[PDB]
Amino acid sequence: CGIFAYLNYHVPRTRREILETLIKGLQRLEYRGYDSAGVGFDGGNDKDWEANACKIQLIKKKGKVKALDEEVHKQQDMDLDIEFDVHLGIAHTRWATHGEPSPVNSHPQRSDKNNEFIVIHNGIITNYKDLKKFLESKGYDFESETDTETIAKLVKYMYDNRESQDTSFTTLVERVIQQLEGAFALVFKSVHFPGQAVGTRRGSPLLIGVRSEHKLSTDHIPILYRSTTCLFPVEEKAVEYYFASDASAVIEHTNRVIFLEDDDVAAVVDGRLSIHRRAVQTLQMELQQIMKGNFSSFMQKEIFEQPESVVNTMRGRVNFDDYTVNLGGLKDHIKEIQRCRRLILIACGTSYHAGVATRQVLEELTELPVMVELASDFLDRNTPVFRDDVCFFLSQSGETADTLMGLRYCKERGALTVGITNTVGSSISRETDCGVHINAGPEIGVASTKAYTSQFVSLVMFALMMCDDRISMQERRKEIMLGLKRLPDLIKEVLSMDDEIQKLATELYHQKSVLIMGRGYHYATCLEGALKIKEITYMHSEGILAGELKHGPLALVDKLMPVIMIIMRDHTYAKCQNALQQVVARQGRPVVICDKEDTETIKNTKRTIKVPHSVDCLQGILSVIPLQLLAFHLAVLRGYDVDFPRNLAKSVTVE
Amino acid sequence: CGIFAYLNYHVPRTRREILETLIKGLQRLEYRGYDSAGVGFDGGNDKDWEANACKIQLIKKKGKVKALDEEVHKQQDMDLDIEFDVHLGIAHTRWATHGEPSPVNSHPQRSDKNNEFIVIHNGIITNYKDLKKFLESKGYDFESETDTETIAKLVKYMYDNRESQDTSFTTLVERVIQQLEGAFALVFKSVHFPGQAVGTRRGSPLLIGVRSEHKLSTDHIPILYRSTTCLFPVEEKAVEYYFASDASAVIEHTNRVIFLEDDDVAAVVDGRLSIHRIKHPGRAVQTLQMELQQIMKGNFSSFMQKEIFEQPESVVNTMRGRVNFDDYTVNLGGLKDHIKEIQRCRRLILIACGTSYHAGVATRQVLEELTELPVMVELASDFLDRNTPVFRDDVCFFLSQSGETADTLMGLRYCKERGALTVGITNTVGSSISRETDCGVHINAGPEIGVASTKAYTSQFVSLVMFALMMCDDRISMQERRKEIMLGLKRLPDLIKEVLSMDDEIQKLATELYHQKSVLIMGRGYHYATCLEGALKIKEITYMHSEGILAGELKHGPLALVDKLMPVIMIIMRDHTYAKCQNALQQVVARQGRPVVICDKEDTETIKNTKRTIKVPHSVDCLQGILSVIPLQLLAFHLAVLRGYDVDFPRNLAKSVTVE
Numbered sequence A: 001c002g003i004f005a006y007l008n009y010h011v012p013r014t015r016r017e018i019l020e021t022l023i024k025g026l027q028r029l030e031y032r033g034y035d036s037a038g039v040g041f042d043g044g045n046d047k048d049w050e051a052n053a054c055k056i057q058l059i060k061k062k063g064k065v066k067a068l069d070e071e072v073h074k075q076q077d078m079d080l081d082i083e084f085d086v087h088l089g090i091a092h093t094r095w096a097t098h099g100e101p102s103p104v105n106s107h108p109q110r111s112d113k114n115n116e117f118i119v120i121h122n123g124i125i126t127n128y129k130d131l132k133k134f135l136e137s138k139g140y141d142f143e144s145e146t147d148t149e150t151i152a153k154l155v156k157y158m159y160d161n162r163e164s165q166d167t168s169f170t171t172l173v174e175r176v177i178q179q180l181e182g183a184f185a186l187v188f189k190s191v192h193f194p195g196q197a198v199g200t201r202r203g204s205p206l207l208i209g210v211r212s213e214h215k216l217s218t219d220h221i222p223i224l225y226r227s228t229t230c231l232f233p234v235e236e237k238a239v240e241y242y243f244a245s246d247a248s249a250v251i252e253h254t255n256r257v258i259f260l261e262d263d264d265v266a267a268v269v270d271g272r273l274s275i276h277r278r279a280v281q282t283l284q285m286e287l288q289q290i291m292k293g294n295f296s297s298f299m300q301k302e303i304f305e306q307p308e309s310v311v312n313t314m315r316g317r318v319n320f321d322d323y324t325v326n327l328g329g330l331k332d333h334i335k336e337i338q339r340c341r342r343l344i345l346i347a348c349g350t351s352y353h354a355g356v357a358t359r360q361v362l363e364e365l366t367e368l369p370v371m372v373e374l375a376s377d378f379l380d381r382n383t384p385v386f387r388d389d390v391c392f393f394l395s396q397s398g399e400t401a402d403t404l405m406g407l408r409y410c411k412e413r414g415a416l417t418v419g420i421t422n423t424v425g426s427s428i429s430r431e432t433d434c435g436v437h438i439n440a441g442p443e444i445g446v447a448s449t450k451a452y453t454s455q456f457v458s459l460v461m462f463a464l465m466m467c468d469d470r471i472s473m474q475e476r477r478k479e480i481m482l483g484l485k486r487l488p489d490l491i492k493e494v495l496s497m498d499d500e501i502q503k504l505a506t507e508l509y510h511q512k513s514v515l516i517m518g519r520g521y522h523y524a525t526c527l528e529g530a531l532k533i534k535e536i537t538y539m540h541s542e543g544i545l546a547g548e549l550k551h552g553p554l555a556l557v558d559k560l561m562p563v564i565m566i567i568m569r570d571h572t573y574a575k576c577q578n579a580l581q582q583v584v585a586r587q588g589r590p591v592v593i594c595d596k597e598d599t600e601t602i603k604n605t606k607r608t609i610k611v612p613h614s615v616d617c618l619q620g621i622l623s624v625i626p627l628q629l630l631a632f633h634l635a636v637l638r639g640y641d642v643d644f645p646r647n648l649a650k651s652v653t654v655e
Numbered sequence B: 001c002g003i004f005a006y007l008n009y010h011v012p013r014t015r016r017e018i019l020e021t022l023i024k025g026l027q028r029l030e031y032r033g034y035d036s037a038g039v040g041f042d043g044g045n046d047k048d049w050e051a052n053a054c055k056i057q058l059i060k061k062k063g064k065v066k067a068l069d070e071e072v073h074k075q076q077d078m079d080l081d082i083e084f085d086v087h088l089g090i091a092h093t094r095w096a097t098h099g100e101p102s103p104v105n106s107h108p109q110r111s112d113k114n115n116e117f118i119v120i121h122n123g124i125i126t127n128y129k130d131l132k133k134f135l136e137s138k139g140y141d142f143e144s145e146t147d148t149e150t151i152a153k154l155v156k157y158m159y160d161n162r163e164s165q166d167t168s169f170t171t172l173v174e175r176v177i178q179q180l181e182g183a184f185a186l187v188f189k190s191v192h193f194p195g196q197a198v199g200t201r202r203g204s205p206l207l208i209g210v211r212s213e214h215k216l217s218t219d220h221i222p223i224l225y226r227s228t229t230c231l232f233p234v235e236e237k238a239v240e241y242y243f244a245s246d247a248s249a250v251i252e253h254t255n256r257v258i259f260l261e262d263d264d265v266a267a268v269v270d271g272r273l274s275i276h277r278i279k280h281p282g283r284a285v286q287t288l289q290m291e292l293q294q295i296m297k298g299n300f301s302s303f304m305q306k307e308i309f310e311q312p313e314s315v316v317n318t319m320r321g322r323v324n325f326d327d328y329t330v331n332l333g334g335l336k337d338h339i340k341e342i343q344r345c346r347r348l349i350l351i352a353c354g355t356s357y358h359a360g361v362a363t364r365q366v367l368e369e370l371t372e373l374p375v376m377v378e379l380a381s382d383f384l385d386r387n388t389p390v391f392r393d394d395v396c397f398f399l400s401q402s403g404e405t406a407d408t409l410m411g412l413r414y415c416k417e418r419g420a421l422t423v424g425i426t427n428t429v430g431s432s433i434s435r436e437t438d439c440g441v442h443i444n445a446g447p448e449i450g451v452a453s454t455k456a457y458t459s460q461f462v463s464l465v466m467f468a469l470m471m472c473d474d475r476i477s478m479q480e481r482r483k484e485i486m487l488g489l490k491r492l493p494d495l496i497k498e499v500l501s502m503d504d505e506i507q508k509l510a511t512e513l514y515h516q517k518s519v520l521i522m523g524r525g526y527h528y529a530t531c532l533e534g535a536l537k538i539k540e541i542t543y544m545h546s547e548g549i550l551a552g553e554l555k556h557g558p559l560a561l562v563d564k565l566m567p568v569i570m571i572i573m574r575d576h577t578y579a580k581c582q583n584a585l586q587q588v589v590a591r592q593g594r595p596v597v598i599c600d601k602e603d604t605e606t607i608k609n610t611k612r613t614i615k616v617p618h619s620v621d622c623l624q625g626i627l628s629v630i631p632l633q634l635l636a637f638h639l640a641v642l643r644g645y646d647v648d649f650p651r652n653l654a655k656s657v658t659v660e
């Protein structure tokens, strides 16, 4: 779910310029939740914008943001020509994990049939049931089934029982959050406080952007406790704020945000931002990083840009002249990491596959036990963790709920915690003792592509550090590093087969299932490949450990069942050939992903995807890219959108 | 694939009785699958059995043992009434690997057109190419495309080039195995050694049963290297020996067996059994607690159905003598001399393949809880590929119903080389994994004759839980938890009967999925293994694409498969993950999914809001996995029966037949 609001203080904007800014802001956040959307602005059609702040209008509709963008326009009541010198508008896109994605369950929620208080919420209230019964007894009627409505009906209860006639909007919100349990990122708007916005958070992101041609009064807003305190233009009033749950919706307008913190109750009053209970900083992000460029989809871009993101992951960290690896984020801890006795990799989904993909080389080069855990199961079992465990947390977004709770679980037990993240300032990167930012750039597509290969590369670089003092492993280190030097170009070679992959997708788009088989370094490849095909093509694809065929799953193979096998020139080659012979003996007709030089396999197999050879512990990067491409093409053939798969969105930050 | 030889020494038997005993032996080995069978015996119709010892007759045929039995009695020139005071008959069921199924490629393989030597073989001779080239150059013509025939021709080569006229049958076979490469179990017979048998093995099971109304000379056969030294009846000669590759072919005659080991050469000479070796070590004569009834279908139409519905009994047999509900104590006799060391180790590693691996996943959480040690569960094939680090203070468990799975066995030797304490959780006495582990527990579920693991899974489950209960029997703070679990085991057999009484409800579900091509089985926590195991059963038995999905992973991708057309089975039990399982259910339903829910009888909320629910009784949280997987065992069974499949037919065949 995404949050976005636009507050133009003494910056005249027509009602069309404001609505096109709220929609354009949700488009930047649509990848976090596209089951429904809504906006909240001021109604009425009075030339004097002052006589319109008392009327709130809510336009909410089911579907992606494009369904709402059309619902806003072509209306017979809203005149899109009114000039507003001061106006506040809030928007929201929702990931409806429960119930129906109806307009009533979408945000903003309202407190009454006259819209005196409207709020947009990201997160969950763990006690909204108790709050709902208390509010129903005092005379408040509920309409929606969401936990967000208990926040709108409650901020009005704190307003109907205030002590003074002019209690600040902050005091009302402060009394609400004290009754709310769980996490939340709220943005309020009320007719009683025209133009005044309030943004409080607790375990959920929420920043405030600012733009103004004038000089700002400070760059370090001092947090307060219940002229030289608020952020505002000095001489004039022309200022534009941008509340948002992510920086992508604000970079297009400005690169000056104020990241809030837990329980920081920000408030814009008279166009002055003040925090209650900061640092006005610049964003290290360019707009081109969140643009599709000349690609028809973000996922396609992010796949074909893996030659570059692999390079950025190694930038300033790998020196091929002298074969040295330095991860700055682990300089002050690499010594203590080496005195520990076990590695534990904890993550969900594709990030968990990255740990599977690198488990073997980590075991080889560190010689420590390595355990790879799915976060949700790690928590269910109350896995034993000890003071001399080193726990890695792989999370592209750095906000995954299960991975984050696993982190706090391990910290409570004294383990050294290491983060492998792609989002600076995220919960997981902050709360870990150390870590590495994989520096892959923003990932917009729901299905992770470059985050997997960048996590892969990052864990390999770590392994290379852990053994840089072993004489016996010096050559092995050079071998791997020479592989990394050649990886970007070998990735380009794999991408050049895009057309050949597309041809093969036309021979499979109609099937209902596909088994992907591999072992060793390519177990993770067949798990991740199966996950991608599931996620965006909706075919029933399943990864099967090749060595496990003889123990049951081989019974499913016949001349009709599609099969993809991965056979690379590493130490499991012969065992992979036996698995291939078993599939053939069952009349299977598999597609084999093999090395170009593997002439024996290429002759005896009709359909082969010939990838270039690399180091065994890097080949997994080259063998998974074809399956990223296959899933992409299969989705296009089946008429699906690769960037917006059904039933979910990107980053699981709630239950 | 199956070996059986019957040696009656001074126990008069007619030719009919001998042949019926060979046929009956192969009938006990058919469940292992085969494409042909054959028998070898003494031909000739001379009323004196002593003159018929130089005429070996072979009857081999492609097809089932039934057809062989018909071919046996369909012999016009054979007199079935001759009485033999001493005789050796050998029999074999073949799973063709080298050479296509045929009479010529069936066993026994002969050494020449006069059948001077014959041999039956389980396995593959890797270097059979070089061996065939050599013997051909020395002037030995082959007639079959089997690797086995090289064994028969080679033993005659050693005989043809013996130094003295009285070199022992053992010596010849010793010189043969020293030239063979690969895996083999063998039984030899020859006109030049009438009444004698030689059996040897390398990488393939071979055992010897013995029966005699007289006192036997010893229960521990010493090894002889290249009276008091061998096994024999004392006061009289009468004795019967049974060579076999599986105890199922011996248990009806005797329960006293000797388990041969790699490169042992066992020989019966003048009715006395000795075990020679080229390398006081000996081989024990032990008593098997196996009964013929345990390998018969009885009133059940299939072994799968029997082994599912008898799980109330097998669970009881797994616990017998090991749990004391009178004072809440657990005693696994097999761990008495090692439990102290195990408690001083620092990590548990469970290593297994397939369903046996699922048993580790199903008991990982309770092992962690009750031992407080790290518990790592590893698929044997991947454990080996990665060269997993193993240390001297690791306790490595090896779960295996058969005790012969190659990868699990190689993982066992991997861990022994690194000094780890090794523990077996097995269901086959005398199997490789039982012998080679430092210690272990025989789960005592009875032989598993069905193709798919049913009672073995639940008995492995119970056995690992019992081990967890031993590991914490000294912790005051855990006494209550141990009592709760042991009262759950006390009630488990009756709870299983309750679940089995819902068979009708499971059939209804089978017809609903009759036409379906896929089904997602979703669960978490204690029931992650239930999903994986249920998905493997339905794949193996029903041949539809069933897949287990960890419920907590739905929102990370796999949930995209849910729509109004995808069948789904969800497991929601009354444990600590109940709320998270409800969340997963709301996620599915929100996307038009209409799942079938396996839940507790008294979960009224889910029963009303879900159309079809399989309602199992509630047990301890760490035991519910046994009750929640049984409806999936039955589901797989009924779907296959509906689709015309033979649940007792393997199908899963290895690589094709090398024709050469």
Ligand SMILES: CC(=O)N[C@H]1[C@@H](OP(=O)(O)OP(=O)(O)OC[C@H]2O[C@@H](n3ccc(=O)[nH]c3=O)[C@H](O)[C@@H]2O)O[C@H](CO)[C@H](O)[C@@H]1O
Binding pocket: A316, A327, A328, A329, A330, A418, A419, A420, A421, A424, A428, A429, A430, A432, A433, A434, A435, A436, A437, A438
């Ligand atoms: C964010 C930042 O200023 N990065 C700078 C840092 O990159 P580096 O490559 O040296 O470090 P990094 O970006 O990987 O990590 C930055 C800091 O965050 C910590 N960390 C990182 C990831 C995680 O999940 N958890 C965690 O605690 C890490 O321990 C370090 O203290 O130095 C570079 C020059 O060499 C550049 O100046 C980079 O801009």
Ligand SMILES: CC(=O)N[C@H]1[C@@H](OP(=O)(O)OP(=O)(O)OC[C@H]2O[C@@H](n3ccc(=O)[nH]c3=O)[C@H](O)[C@@H]2O)O[C@H](CO)[C@H](O)[C@@H]1O
Binding pocket: B287, B289, B332, B333, B334, B335, B423, B424, B425, B426, B429, B433, B434, B435, B437, B438, B439, B440, B441, B442
């Ligand atoms: C096989 C056998 O005759 N067991 C007898 C033994 O059972 P316990 O129930 O006393 O033995 P159970 O078969 O576990 O173990 C028998 C022996 O085999 C060993 N073992 C077992 C399984 C494995 O995978 N690895 C391994 O090393 C185990 O350490 C022990 O030395 O005593 C009983 C009486 O109390 C009965 O007389 C049982 O028949």
Ligand SMILES: O=C[C@H](O)[C@@H](O)[C@H](O)[C@H](O)COP(=O)(O)O
Binding pocket: A348, A349, A350, A351, A352, A394, A395, A396, A397, A398, A399, A400, A403, A446, A447, A448, A531, A532, A535, A651, A652, B555, B556, B557
């Ligand atoms: O293609 C699938 C998605 O990428 C998904 O599986 C993702 O990997 C997880 O939701 C974990 O997300 P993070 O890596 O951001 O924590």
Ligand SMILES: O=C[C@H](O)[C@@H](O)[C@H](O)[C@H](O)COP(=O)(O)O
Binding pocket: A550, A551, A552, B353, B354, B355, B356, B357, B399, B400, B401, B402, B403, B404, B405, B408, B451, B452, B453, B536, B537, B540
């Ligand atoms: O139904 C499943 C099968 O039984 C199969 O998966 C079996 O579990 C493995 O082949 C391991 O066999 P063992 O338990 O004999 O090692």
Ligand SMILES: N[C@@H](CCC(=O)O)C(=O)O
Binding pocket: B001, B002, B093, B094, B095, B096, B097, B098, B099, B105, B121, B122, B123, B124, B125, B146, B147, B148
């Ligand atoms: N390799 C031998 C024996 C195989 C077996 O039945 O185990 C053959 O194919 O004849």
Ligand SMILES: [Mg+2]
Binding pocket: A429, A430, A431, A432, A433, A434
């Ligand atoms: Mg940090």
Ligand SMILES: [Mg+2]
Binding pocket: B434, B435, B436, B437, B438, B439, B440
């Ligand atoms: Mg043993």
